[PDB]
Amino acid sequence: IHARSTGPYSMITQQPLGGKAQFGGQRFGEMECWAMQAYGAAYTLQELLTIKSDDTVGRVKVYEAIVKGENIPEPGIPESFKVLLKELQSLCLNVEVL
Amino acid sequence: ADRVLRGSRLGAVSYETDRNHDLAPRQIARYRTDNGEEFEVPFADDAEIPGTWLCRNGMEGTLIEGDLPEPKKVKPPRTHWDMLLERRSIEELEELLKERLELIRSR
Amino acid sequence: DSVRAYLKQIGKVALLNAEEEVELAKRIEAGLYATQLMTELSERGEKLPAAQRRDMMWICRDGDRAKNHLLEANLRLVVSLAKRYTGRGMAFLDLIQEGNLGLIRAVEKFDYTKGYKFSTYATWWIRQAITRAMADQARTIRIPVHMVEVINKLGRIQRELLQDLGREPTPEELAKEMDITPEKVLEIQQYAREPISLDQTIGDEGDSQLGDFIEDSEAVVAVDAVSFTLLQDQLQSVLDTLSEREAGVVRLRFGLTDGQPRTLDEIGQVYGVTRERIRQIESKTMSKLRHPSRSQVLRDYL
Amino acid sequence: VNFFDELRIGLATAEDIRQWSYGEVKKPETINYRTLKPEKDGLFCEKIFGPTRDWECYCGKYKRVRFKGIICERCGVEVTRAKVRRERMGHIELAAPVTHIWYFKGVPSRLGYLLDLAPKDLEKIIYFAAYVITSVDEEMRHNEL
Amino acid sequence: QTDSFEWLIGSPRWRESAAERGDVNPVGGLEEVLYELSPIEDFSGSMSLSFSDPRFDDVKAPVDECKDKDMTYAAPLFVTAEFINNNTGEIKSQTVFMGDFPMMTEKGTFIINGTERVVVSQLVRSPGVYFDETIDKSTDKTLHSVKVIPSRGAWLEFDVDKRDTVGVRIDRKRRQPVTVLLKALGWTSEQIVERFGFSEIMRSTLEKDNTVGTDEALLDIYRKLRPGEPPTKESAQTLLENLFFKEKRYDLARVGRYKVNKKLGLHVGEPITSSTLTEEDVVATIEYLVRLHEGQTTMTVPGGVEVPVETDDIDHFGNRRLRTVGELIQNQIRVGMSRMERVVRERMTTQDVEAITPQTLINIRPVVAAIKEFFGTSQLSQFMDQNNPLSGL
Amino acid sequence: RYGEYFTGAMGAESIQKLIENFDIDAEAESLRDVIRNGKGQKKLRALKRLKVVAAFQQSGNSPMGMVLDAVPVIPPELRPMVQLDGGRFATSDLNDLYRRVINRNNRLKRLIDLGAPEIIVNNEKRMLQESVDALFDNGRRGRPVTGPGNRPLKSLSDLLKGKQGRFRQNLLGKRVDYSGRSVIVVGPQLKLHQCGLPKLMALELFKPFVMKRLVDLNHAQNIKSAKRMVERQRPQVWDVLEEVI
Amino acid sequence: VQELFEARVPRGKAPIADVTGRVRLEDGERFYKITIVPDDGGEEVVYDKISKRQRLRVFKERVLSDGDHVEVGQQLMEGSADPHEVLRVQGPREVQIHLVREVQEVYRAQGVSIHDKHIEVIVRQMLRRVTIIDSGSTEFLPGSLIDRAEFEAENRRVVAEGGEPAAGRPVLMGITKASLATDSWLSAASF
Ligand SMILES: [Zn+2]
Secondary structure: OEEEOOOOEOOOOOOEOOOOOOOOOEEEOOHHHHHHHHHOOHHHHHHHHHHOOOOHHHHHHHHHHHHHOOOOOOOOOOHHHHHHHHHHHOOOEEEEEO | OOOOEEEEOOOOOOOOOOOOOOOOOEEEEEEEEOOOOOEEEEEEOOOOOOOOEEOOOOOEEEOOOOOOOOOOOOOOOOOHHHHHHHHOOHHHHHHHHHHHHHHHHOO | OHHHHHHHHHOOOOOOOHHHHHHHHHHHHHHHHHHHHHHHHHHHOOOOOOHHHHHHHHHHHHHHHHHHHHHHHHHHHHHHHHOOOOOOOOOHHHHHHHHHHHHHHHHHOOOOOOOOOHHHHHHHHHHHHHHHHHHHOOOOOOOOHHHHHHHHHHHHHHHHHHHHHOOOOOHHHHHHHOOOOHHHHHHHHHHOOOOEEOOOOOOOOOOOOOHHHEEEOOOOOOHHHHHHHHHHHHHHHHHOOOOHHHHHHHHHHHOOOOOOOOOHHHHHHOOOOOHHHHHHHHHHHHHHHOOHHHHHHHOOOO | OOOOOOEEEEEOOHHHHHHHOOOEOOOOOOEOOOOOOEOOOOOOOHHHHOOOOOOOOOOOOOOOOOOOOOEEOOOOEEOOOOHHHHOOOEEEEEEEEEEOOOOOOOOOOHHHHHOOOOHHHHHHHHOOOOOEEEEEOOHHHHHOO | OHHHHOOOOOOHHHHHHHHHOOOOOOOOHHHHHHHHHOOEEOOOOOEEEEEEEEEEOOOOOOHHHHHHHOOOOEEEEEEEEEEEEOOOOOOEEEEEEEEEEEOOOOOOOEEEOOEEEEEOOEEEEOOEEEEEEEEOOOOOOEEEEEEEEOOOOOOEEOOEOOOOOEOOOEOOOOOOOHHHHHHOOOOOHHHHHHHHOOOOOOHHHHHOOOOOOHHHHHHHHHHHHOOOOOOOOHHHHHOHHHOOOOOOOOOOOHHHHHHHHHHHOOOOOOOOOOOOOOOHHHHHHHHHHHHHOOOOOEEEEOOEEEEEOOOOOOOOHHHEEEEOHHHHHHHHHHHHHHHHHHHHOOHHHHOOOOOOOHHHHOOOHHHHHHHHHHHOOOOOEEEOOOOOHHHHO | OOOOOEEEEOOHHHHHHHHHOOOOHHHHHHHHHHHHHOOOOOOHHHHHHHHHHHHHHHOOOOHHHHEEEEEEEOOHHHOOOEEEOOOEEEEOOHHHHHHHHHHHHHHHHHHHHHOOOHHHHHHHHHHHHHHHHHHHOOOOOOOOOEOHHHOEOOOHHHHHOOOOOHHHHHHOOEEEOOEEEOOOOOOOOOOOOOOOOOHHHHHHHOHHHHHHHHHHOOOOOOHHHHHHHHHHOOOOOHHHHHHHO | OHHHHHOOOOOOEOOEOOOOEEEEEEOOOOOOEEEEEEOOOOOOEEEOOOOOOOOEOOOOOOOOOOOOEEOOOOEOEOOEOOHHHHHHHOOHHHHHHHHHHHHHHHHHHOOOOOOHHHHHHHHHHHHOEEEOOOOOOOOOOOOOEEEHHHHHHHOOOOOOOOOOOOOOOEOOOOHHHHHHOOOOOOOOOOO
């Protein structure tokens, strides 16, 4: 049995950490996401890969919104994505968004 | 060593609240580097304005103004001439250059 | 590997002996006194003619030729001395460069009227460059060199004494023999270790790394963070129900509306009152705060 | 923004990179051994990368939210979050020009087409085995030949 | 497992046990590393060092204590060594405490830091001669090879080309001819015809051998070795006999020795024990190979037992043996002395003459470092699954 | 003699002199004349060259970036340094590589000012170039840079390419919370839209929601009595739980 | 099936017919000997070496033999069909139906019902691009593969300029090979 709402996280990434004395975390794969595309329930995916995985500043917002019972806030930019952009900017790349 | 083990960052963690009003006022000097630049550097409104300052370039420069405090306090390097003049004399180099300059003078 | 091209580079050099660089020193020093002769010639003006220009310019080039000829002649000395301090700390080419710089300083400080071998002269500067460079750039955390003294002495007495007992020594024994406390040598044994890398595999298959397992005790807990703001909200809701004066006394006193604890006379200074007037209203306020109807909602907030 | 049209990639020019960074370091140091605090001009340099401790300058003279956007010119550190240290890029100016590798050792070498040169011949150029004529006048050779 | 342990110690129970069922001259497992290791000789030939008498002391704590107090279940180890000068002869005999040594229970177990751990048996192929025949798909004909592997050395393969003839590259150096191995081995081209001419496909090797002269082709052999080095009288025969007739770096298995005799129909009624490779076995597998690729069924040898000619199997049990734990720990003591002695012979020079006791030359530390090194971090040492007595069995 | 006329040098600054003193256009239409005239291994070379000369010819870029005079530095939290308990330090591999860079730049930087024979100069610049190369990608030119244990380090491309790649960082998938797993049995009295649920795991999952609801009716003072009261598993949570599910 | 989607050379090689007419059937050195006579006629087509283990194909009326009338693209022996040559001869529309019957047969052998239009969806990406046989007038490198709709959009601006006879055939290519030719560049980075 494993179960978790909120617990410890990694120091390298912001992902939940799972071991014996940890609550465990549930590893969500790839074909799973393919079937999520097959429904096309994309707001679920935006819920999954952002506020549940890597963006720290959203977790306080959605958690506190659940505390007050207010509206679900909009999922902000996955900051883990922007980490790749900084890696590209490390290697002589004028990358840019328009 | 796969076991649930904790390490440490360094620094501080604070749960302070956020706001965008009632902050301390400021003042802006625009320091000028050697390579013709103007860098709007915000300073706290109660502060001192120093003379030299390493800037966003990674170099130091002067102010927005033309005070020019001092181009001094630097020292010359310990050259090979000083290290020569420790163990050798002026007469040594004068007569020795009479020897060598004689040797090119006689070719 | 640039050792092939670099030994290949220095292999073109001919070896030199003592009596040559005796004269080459006169050529170089003739170059430097022709140099300062040129600078003082620029000081006083009155420029010498063309032959008395090309002779000093010629000998200024000549001291560079014999100088660089000597440096070429002792790159082989840099290799021959440096070539056994490998296997530890630093890449060999770095050792080449710092041996070159120490050899430059030894060239700058050499005398031939002392009558010695030039290499035996330079050996202090070369090995001293080894101690300096390996003192600097061999660790992730730079340790000052006086501690490196007892790193060398501690590894010496520790290794040789470890042979003397024939086994692992105890820290109180090193505290006895190296005449310190066991907490001293224990601190040094803490300092001596290299940092562990992050990217190696965990001993097995083979896909995961080490970075998956790092527990933060300085992590951002959510429930205290939400708890903190609503706590401040309960500070507002409870603290605004008391009197007009005591709100300003507690807020301006405790550093709440501004963030800084103040002296006694500072908040009495804006009111035009005494310190005792502040202390009796504040202390009586502390009697008001231990009224338990307020304390009931605030006890769990500890 | 969250209204993105494209995402275009080019070579980062030298001026833009030194428009990106907030400073240039010059020491091979991380921290002190004892107090474990970041050193000047090394790795983790607070002066160009920011506060490791939340809203606390290294001078330690200011701590509060009302002191924000300002610079302790004693510490040389702007007062802000610590999390932005995962965002600030640095740079190092060079003492000599340096070629990039992905145009050279990549197959085929776009450098080798780019000036119409052999790869193996270019290798001994950039690994410094031989000279090459880069520019010669034709006037003085021509008429004075 | 109990009789496997039993043997590095070499029990009296092991002595009679492996003495009544034949077993003429039983030698200890430690001894098996001793007499190949001892005597120790310097490069100058002026001093010498010897080992003798592996034995054991008593236990220091019972199993309930060791499992309780979380230690190793060990016992001391004594081996009586001797330094012997070669210039005058010296009798520095000194029984040296070689270190602690882990011990097996009557449960067949081991205790490391209180943890009960188990040694797993590791199946490996036996070294020896592996004959094989493959058929290509261009011209669909029959090439006949053999791969002969020793223990701890290089390899050699006697192949057959798609055309004529052979495949005789040793340690994978492109090809060799059979005759230059034999003529450069020091044999006439006449005896190539006499002993190996019936066997007529190799007459084409003696045709296209393209070099007449023993050393005149053996210099080209050394050109096949390096390439590009002026050969001397060293690299003519002695370097080759450092690969096949020096038993210090090229040492096939004792059973692999027995497997060579057993396959090749050698002088097998022999109590022999060695790891040296004669070339007579090499020409024997040459002629067995060509009698195979001429098409036969049987074969005898002058001086030995006749052999039915056949190909070999890959995964047959006679080709795939078991390294037991005493062979495992035997290898770990072997590498432990391989790392231990490799500074001792180095310090046979730089230590002071007449001022050395055998205690000053022995470092017992890397040995026990190799032991505790072995029981940690190996996938052959695992925890006992104690949740079912069946499971533990 | 004749050194007044030509210019010759070595390495990357001369390469920059090549790049600055180069034009696209007459080269380009020259290769247009080749693909009008030539054929075989006279046009195909102009083909393979004409693609990339055409590529610089199209966009408003320059080949200036192919050489560099400034090297950027990645933010430090992507090479973070962690101390464990007991004073056990761990960090990234890239940092001492940057240290080799800064030591060679300051080393050359001080060494030029004295002046030197050129044997030193191409040595130091060559070490600088290889330091840049090992910074970007270890093992591409010659022997790979290994450290302790004779094992190779992690360069920039190592963070990008391989089994830590863009699949293996992004599209590999990861673990998230508000989840769980257990073993399953049959529920044959249920309906299709129905399912069952083990209740300890359920209350373990729905913690912030029930923590909201239990305080709303006055069973609790705050979040802290809420969460602590959950950790005590007091019997007042259950009738709340059927409402919140 | 996995090879039949990347569409390599099948090991069960049997040629198909190339022209209508009759056949001249013979034996050869351990294989067979095959000659097709055209119907118009003209050049007679000869097939040399197909192993006698790979025996005849059955048509409908009962068995292939010598003197038999030859169709447009009838397969000659048992085995498997090359996609590229029946593409070269009969046309794309057929090769569609061919691959449908081939994969569809494989799922029919286990009796698993999969609707055809999914297979059609997989078909549609396989014939998107064409090659450059002739450069024509406009920058088209031969040996390259170019989208058909872009090729027809570039030939749509056929205002005079000198004519543009950029020639190309419809090109089948393997689905990995086809999947390399993208524009999105980070899916391309994902290999
Ligand atoms: Zn400060």
